[PDB]
Amino acid sequence: LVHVASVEKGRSYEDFQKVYNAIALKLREDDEYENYIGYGPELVRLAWHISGTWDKHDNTGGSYGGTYRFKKEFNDPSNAGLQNGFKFLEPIHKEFPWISSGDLFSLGGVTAVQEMQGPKIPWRCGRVDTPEDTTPDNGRLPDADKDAGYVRTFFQRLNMNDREVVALMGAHALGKTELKNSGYEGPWGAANNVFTNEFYLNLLNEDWKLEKNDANNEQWDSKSGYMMLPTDYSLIQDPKYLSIVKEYANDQDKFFKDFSKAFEKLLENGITFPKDAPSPFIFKTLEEQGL
Numbered sequence: 001l002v003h004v005a006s007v008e009k010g011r012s013y014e015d016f017q018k019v020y021n022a023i024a025l026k027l028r029e030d031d032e033y034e035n036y037i038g039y040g041p042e043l044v045r046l047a048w049h050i051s052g053t054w055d056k057h058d059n060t061g062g063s064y065g066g067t068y069r070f071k072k073e074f075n076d077p078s079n080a081g082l083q084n085g086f087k088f089l090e091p092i093h094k095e096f097p098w099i100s101s102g103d104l105f106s107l108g109g110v111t112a113v114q115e116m117q118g119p120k121i122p123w124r125c126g127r128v129d130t131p132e133d134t135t136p137d138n139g140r141l142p143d144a145d146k147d148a149g150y151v152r153t154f155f156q157r158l159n160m161n162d163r164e165v166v167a168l169m170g171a172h173a174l175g176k177t178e179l180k181n182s183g184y185e186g187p188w189g190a191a192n193n194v195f196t197n198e199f200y201l202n203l204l205n206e207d208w209k210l211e212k213n214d215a216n217n218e219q220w221d222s223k224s225g226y227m228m229l230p231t232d233y234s235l236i237q238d239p240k241y242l243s244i245v246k247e248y249a250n251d252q253d254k255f256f257k258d259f260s261k262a263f264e265k266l267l268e269n270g271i272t273f274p275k276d277a278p279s280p281f282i283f284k285t286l287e288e289q290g291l
Protein backbone atom coordinates (compact mmCIF):
# COMPACT_ATOMS: atom_id res chain seq x y z
CA LEU A 1 0.00 0.00 0.00
CA VAL A 2 0.93 3.55 -0.94
CA HIS A 3 -0.33 6.71 0.80
CA VAL A 4 0.10 9.75 -1.43
CA ALA A 5 -0.03 13.16 0.27
CA SER A 6 -2.99 15.21 -0.95
CA VAL A 7 -2.97 18.93 -0.14
CA GLU A 8 -6.29 20.04 1.38
CA LYS A 9 -8.29 21.84 -1.33
CA GLY A 10 -6.93 25.36 -1.83
CA ARG A 11 -4.83 25.52 1.32
CA SER A 12 -1.32 26.87 1.68
CA TYR A 13 1.18 28.01 4.28
CA GLU A 14 -0.93 30.81 5.74
CA ASP A 15 -3.90 28.41 6.22
CA PHE A 16 -1.74 26.07 8.35
CA GLN A 17 -0.07 28.91 10.27
CA LYS A 18 -3.57 29.92 11.45
CA VAL A 19 -4.17 26.37 12.72
CA TYR A 20 -0.71 26.43 14.33
CA ASN A 21 -1.72 29.69 15.94
CA ALA A 22 -5.04 28.33 17.23
CA ILE A 23 -3.16 25.45 18.87
CA ALA A 24 -0.46 27.67 20.34
CA LEU A 25 -3.02 30.13 21.68
CA LYS A 26 -4.98 27.30 23.31
CA LEU A 27 -1.80 26.02 24.98
CA ARG A 28 -1.60 29.43 26.67
CA GLU A 29 -5.30 29.43 27.49
CA ASP A 30 -5.02 26.00 29.12
CA ASP A 31 -1.51 26.41 30.61
CA GLU A 32 -2.76 25.47 34.08
CA TYR A 33 -3.10 21.83 33.05
CA GLU A 34 -1.35 19.33 35.29
CA ASN A 35 -0.29 22.00 37.79
CA TYR A 36 1.13 24.18 35.04
CA ILE A 37 2.97 21.65 32.99
CA GLY A 38 0.37 22.66 30.39
CA TYR A 39 -0.62 20.59 27.38
CA GLY A 40 2.64 20.75 25.41
CA PRO A 41 4.10 17.41 26.51
CA GLU A 42 0.78 15.63 26.02
CA LEU A 43 0.47 16.87 22.43
CA VAL A 44 4.03 15.75 21.68
CA ARG A 45 3.25 12.27 23.09
CA LEU A 46 -0.02 12.19 21.07
CA ALA A 47 1.79 13.07 17.85
CA TRP A 48 4.29 10.27 18.50
CA HIS A 49 1.62 7.67 19.32
CA ILE A 50 -0.40 8.36 16.19
CA SER A 51 2.78 8.01 14.11
CA GLY A 52 4.34 5.14 16.08
CA THR A 53 1.81 2.58 14.89
CA TRP A 54 3.62 2.42 11.53
CA ASP A 55 5.02 -0.89 10.26
CA LYS A 56 7.54 -0.24 7.49
CA HIS A 57 7.21 -3.81 6.20
CA ASP A 58 3.66 -3.39 4.89
CA ASN A 59 2.89 0.32 5.40
CA THR A 60 0.14 -0.38 7.89
CA GLY A 61 -0.47 2.16 10.69
CA GLY A 62 1.24 5.54 10.49
CA SER A 63 0.08 9.13 10.75
CA TYR A 64 -1.45 9.38 7.26
CA GLY A 65 -4.88 7.90 7.97
CA GLY A 66 -5.85 9.77 11.09
CA THR A 67 -6.98 6.49 12.60
CA TYR A 68 -6.56 7.59 16.19
CA ARG A 69 -10.05 9.09 15.81
CA PHE A 70 -11.45 5.53 15.98
CA LYS A 71 -12.20 3.99 19.35
CA LYS A 72 -10.15 0.86 18.63
CA GLU A 73 -7.01 2.98 18.58
CA PHE A 74 -7.88 5.73 21.07
CA ASN A 75 -8.72 3.05 23.63
CA ASP A 76 -5.36 1.30 23.14
CA PRO A 77 -4.00 0.79 26.65
CA SER A 78 -0.77 2.29 25.37
CA ASN A 79 -2.69 5.53 24.65
CA ALA A 80 -3.94 5.99 28.24
CA GLY A 81 -3.35 9.55 29.34
CA LEU A 82 -3.69 11.08 25.85
CA GLN A 83 -7.47 11.40 26.00
CA ASN A 84 -7.18 14.98 27.26
CA GLY A 85 -4.86 15.95 24.40
CA PHE A 86 -7.33 14.48 21.94
CA LYS A 87 -10.10 16.55 23.49
CA PHE A 88 -7.87 19.64 23.39
CA LEU A 89 -7.64 19.30 19.60
CA GLU A 90 -11.27 18.37 18.87
CA PRO A 91 -12.52 21.99 18.98
CA ILE A 92 -9.66 23.28 16.82
CA HIS A 93 -10.74 20.60 14.31
CA LYS A 94 -14.24 22.08 14.59
CA GLU A 95 -12.74 25.52 13.90
CA PHE A 96 -10.84 24.21 10.80
CA PRO A 97 -12.92 21.27 9.47
CA TRP A 98 -10.94 21.27 6.21
CA ILE A 99 -7.76 19.98 7.91
CA SER A 100 -7.33 16.21 7.98
CA SER A 101 -7.10 14.35 11.30
CA GLY A 102 -3.52 13.15 10.75
CA ASP A 103 -2.48 16.66 9.74
CA LEU A 104 -4.03 18.11 12.87
CA PHE A 105 -2.60 15.52 15.27
CA SER A 106 0.91 15.79 13.79
CA LEU A 107 0.77 19.61 13.68
CA GLY A 108 -0.14 19.54 17.41
CA GLY A 109 3.22 17.97 18.17
CA VAL A 110 5.15 20.41 16.04
CA THR A 111 3.39 23.36 17.58
CA ALA A 112 4.02 22.13 21.10
CA VAL A 113 7.74 21.57 20.55
CA GLN A 114 8.22 25.03 19.02
CA GLU A 115 6.08 26.89 21.60
CA MET A 116 8.09 25.16 24.35
CA GLN A 117 11.26 26.80 22.95
CA GLY A 118 12.27 23.69 21.01
CA PRO A 119 13.77 23.61 17.56
CA LYS A 120 11.80 24.57 14.54
CA ILE A 121 10.39 21.40 12.94
CA PRO A 122 9.48 21.51 9.25
CA TRP A 123 6.01 20.09 8.67
CA ARG A 124 4.19 18.90 5.53
CA CYS A 125 0.45 18.73 4.87
CA GLY A 126 -1.64 16.25 2.89
CA ARG A 127 -2.40 13.33 5.20
CA VAL A 128 -5.84 11.96 4.33
CA ASP A 129 -8.33 10.33 6.70
CA THR A 130 -8.75 6.63 5.95
CA PRO A 131 -11.66 4.48 7.16
CA GLU A 132 -12.23 2.44 10.30
CA ASP A 133 -11.07 -0.86 8.76
CA THR A 134 -7.59 0.65 8.30
CA THR A 135 -7.06 1.22 12.03
CA PRO A 136 -4.02 -0.74 13.28
CA ASP A 137 -4.44 -3.31 16.02
CA ASN A 138 -3.33 -2.36 19.51
CA GLY A 139 0.11 -3.44 20.60
CA ARG A 140 2.39 -1.61 18.17
CA LEU A 141 3.75 0.99 20.60
CA PRO A 142 6.83 0.14 22.68
CA ASP A 143 6.96 -1.27 26.20
CA ALA A 144 8.83 0.71 28.85
CA ASP A 145 10.07 -2.32 30.88
CA LYS A 146 12.71 -3.29 28.35
CA ASP A 147 16.43 -3.08 27.55
CA ALA A 148 18.59 -1.57 24.88
CA GLY A 149 18.30 -4.43 22.43
CA TYR A 150 14.55 -4.21 22.65
CA VAL A 151 14.71 -0.50 21.92
CA ARG A 152 17.08 -0.90 18.98
CA THR A 153 15.04 -3.73 17.43
CA PHE A 154 11.75 -1.98 18.11
CA PHE A 155 12.73 1.18 16.34
CA GLN A 156 13.95 -0.66 13.26
CA ARG A 157 10.24 -1.07 12.43
CA LEU A 158 10.05 2.73 12.24
CA ASN A 159 13.23 2.98 10.11
CA MET A 160 15.08 4.69 12.95
CA ASN A 161 18.79 4.20 13.62
CA ASP A 162 20.72 4.69 16.86
CA ARG A 163 21.14 8.44 16.52
CA GLU A 164 17.47 8.91 15.64
CA VAL A 165 16.38 6.75 18.57
CA VAL A 166 18.53 8.59 21.10
CA ALA A 167 17.41 11.95 19.68
CA LEU A 168 13.68 11.12 19.80
CA MET A 169 13.96 9.89 23.38
CA GLY A 170 15.15 13.39 24.31
CA ALA A 171 11.49 14.36 24.29
CA HIS A 172 11.34 12.82 27.78
CA ALA A 173 12.66 16.12 28.98
CA LEU A 174 8.94 16.92 28.74
CA GLY A 175 6.14 16.08 31.13
CA LYS A 176 6.07 13.13 33.42
CA THR A 177 4.91 9.59 34.04
CA GLU A 178 1.75 8.80 36.03
CA LEU A 179 0.85 5.56 37.74
CA LYS A 180 -2.72 5.76 36.51
CA ASN A 181 -1.67 5.95 32.83
CA SER A 182 1.45 3.79 32.53
CA GLY A 183 2.28 2.34 35.92
CA TYR A 184 5.36 4.61 36.27
CA GLU A 185 5.70 7.63 38.56
CA GLY A 186 7.54 10.91 38.20
CA PRO A 187 9.24 13.44 35.95
CA TRP A 188 12.52 13.05 34.14
CA GLY A 189 13.65 16.50 35.26
CA ALA A 190 12.79 19.91 36.68
CA ALA A 191 11.94 22.10 33.72
CA ASN A 192 9.45 19.85 32.09
CA ASN A 193 7.46 22.29 30.00
CA VAL A 194 10.64 23.59 28.33
CA PHE A 195 12.26 21.68 25.46
CA THR A 196 15.96 21.22 26.33
CA ASN A 197 18.65 18.52 26.46
CA GLU A 198 17.89 18.01 30.20
CA PHE A 199 17.01 14.32 29.70
CA TYR A 200 20.56 13.48 28.65
CA LEU A 201 22.16 15.59 31.33
CA ASN A 202 20.06 13.95 34.08
CA LEU A 203 20.69 10.47 32.72
CA LEU A 204 24.44 11.11 32.92
CA ASN A 205 24.70 13.23 36.02
CA GLU A 206 22.20 11.86 38.56
CA ASP A 207 22.80 8.81 40.79
CA TRP A 208 20.11 6.26 39.82
CA LYS A 209 18.75 3.49 42.02
CA LEU A 210 16.51 0.64 40.85
CA GLU A 211 13.29 0.83 42.91
CA LYS A 212 9.86 -0.82 42.81
CA ASN A 213 6.96 1.64 42.49
CA ASP A 214 3.37 1.52 43.69
CA ALA A 215 2.27 -0.39 40.53
CA ASN A 216 4.81 -3.22 41.16
CA ASN A 217 6.94 -1.97 38.23
CA GLU A 218 10.62 -1.19 38.59
CA GLN A 219 12.04 2.19 37.63
CA TRP A 220 15.29 4.13 38.19
CA ASP A 221 15.01 6.92 40.79
CA SER A 222 17.23 9.88 41.86
CA LYS A 223 17.13 11.55 45.25
CA SER A 224 16.17 14.76 43.45
CA GLY A 225 12.81 13.04 42.73
CA TYR A 226 13.40 12.33 39.02
CA MET A 227 13.01 8.97 37.29
CA MET A 228 14.06 7.00 34.26
CA LEU A 229 12.13 4.21 32.60
CA PRO A 230 14.10 0.96 32.09
CA THR A 231 14.15 1.90 28.42
CA ASP A 232 15.57 5.34 29.20
CA TYR A 233 18.26 3.83 31.40
CA SER A 234 19.14 1.42 28.63
CA LEU A 235 20.57 4.37 26.69
CA ILE A 236 23.53 4.53 29.10
CA GLN A 237 23.73 0.73 29.54
CA ASP A 238 24.53 0.28 25.82
CA PRO A 239 27.90 1.59 24.63
CA LYS A 240 26.68 2.88 21.23
CA TYR A 241 23.73 4.67 22.83
CA LEU A 242 25.89 6.02 25.69
CA SER A 243 28.15 7.78 23.19
CA ILE A 244 25.29 9.65 21.61
CA VAL A 245 23.70 10.54 24.93
CA LYS A 246 27.00 12.14 25.85
CA GLU A 247 27.09 14.01 22.57
CA TYR A 248 23.59 15.48 23.14
CA ALA A 249 24.28 16.23 26.80
CA ASN A 250 27.34 18.27 25.72
CA ASP A 251 25.69 20.00 22.74
CA GLN A 252 22.03 21.05 22.81
CA ASP A 253 22.25 22.66 19.36
CA LYS A 254 23.21 19.28 17.85
CA PHE A 255 20.43 17.59 19.76
CA PHE A 256 17.93 20.14 18.45
CA LYS A 257 19.04 19.60 14.86
CA ASP A 258 18.88 15.80 15.07
CA PHE A 259 15.59 15.87 17.03
CA SER A 260 14.04 18.08 14.41
CA LYS A 261 15.00 15.73 11.59
CA ALA A 262 13.98 12.55 13.45
CA PHE A 263 10.63 13.94 14.62
CA GLU A 264 9.70 15.21 11.17
CA LYS A 265 10.68 11.76 9.81
CA LEU A 266 8.52 10.02 12.44
CA LEU A 267 5.55 12.20 11.55
CA GLU A 268 6.00 11.47 7.84
CA ASN A 269 6.76 7.72 7.83
CA GLY A 270 4.44 5.90 5.39
CA ILE A 271 3.74 8.99 3.26
CA THR A 272 4.65 9.43 -0.38
CA PHE A 273 5.01 13.12 -1.33
CA PRO A 274 4.34 13.65 -5.02
CA LYS A 275 7.28 15.26 -6.81
CA ASP A 276 5.37 18.52 -7.18
CA ALA A 277 4.09 18.59 -3.61
CA PRO A 278 4.83 21.84 -1.75
CA SER A 279 8.10 22.24 0.24
CA PRO A 280 7.82 21.63 3.97
CA PHE A 281 6.49 24.53 6.01
CA ILE A 282 8.31 26.17 8.89
CA PHE A 283 5.83 27.96 11.12
CA LYS A 284 6.57 31.09 13.16
CA THR A 285 6.08 30.85 16.92
CA LEU A 286 3.55 33.14 18.61
CA GLU A 287 6.54 35.11 19.93
CA GLU A 288 8.00 35.65 16.44
CA GLN A 289 4.61 36.98 15.32
CA GLY A 290 4.45 39.26 18.34
CA LEU A 291 1.32 37.30 19.25
Ligand code: HEM
Residues within 6 Å of the ligand: 041, 042, 043, 044, 045, 048, 080, 081, 142, 143, 144, 145, 151, 168, 169, 171, 172, 174, 175, 176, 177, 178, 179, 181, 182, 183, 184, 229, 231, 263
Ligand atom coordinates in the same frame (compact mmCIF):
# COMPACT_ATOMS: atom_id res chain seq x y z
C1 HEM B 1 11.20 3.08 23.82
C2 HEM B 1 10.42 4.35 23.51
C3 HEM B 1 9.33 4.87 24.44
C4 HEM B 1 8.82 4.42 25.60
C5 HEM B 1 8.93 3.01 26.20
C6 HEM B 1 8.18 5.52 26.26
C7 HEM B 1 7.49 5.50 27.45
C8 HEM B 1 6.68 6.47 27.98
C9 HEM B 1 6.17 6.49 29.35
C10 HEM B 1 5.58 5.12 29.81
C11 HEM B 1 5.67 7.71 29.60
C12 HEM B 1 4.55 8.06 30.60
C13 HEM B 1 3.09 8.18 30.14
C14 HEM B 1 2.14 8.52 31.35
O1 HEM B 1 2.27 7.87 32.37
O2 HEM B 1 1.34 9.47 31.17
C15 HEM B 1 5.81 8.45 28.34
C16 HEM B 1 5.72 9.84 28.35
C17 HEM B 1 6.08 10.67 27.30
N1 HEM B 1 6.76 10.29 26.16
FE1 HEM B 1 7.60 8.51 25.88
N2 HEM B 1 8.23 6.66 25.45
C18 HEM B 1 9.06 6.34 24.42
C19 HEM B 1 9.42 7.14 23.35
C20 HEM B 1 8.99 8.44 23.16
C21 HEM B 1 9.27 9.26 21.99
C22 HEM B 1 10.06 8.77 20.77
C23 HEM B 1 8.77 10.47 22.25
C24 HEM B 1 8.78 11.75 21.45
C25 HEM B 1 9.55 12.07 20.23
C26 HEM B 1 7.96 10.37 23.46
C27 HEM B 1 7.45 11.46 24.15
C28 HEM B 1 6.86 11.43 25.38
C29 HEM B 1 6.17 12.52 26.03
C30 HEM B 1 6.35 14.00 25.64
C31 HEM B 1 5.69 12.07 27.20
C32 HEM B 1 5.23 12.93 28.41
C33 HEM B 1 3.71 13.15 28.14
C34 HEM B 1 2.99 13.96 29.18
O3 HEM B 1 3.51 14.31 30.25
O4 HEM B 1 1.78 14.15 28.90
N3 HEM B 1 8.21 9.15 24.07
N4 HEM B 1 6.76 7.80 27.57
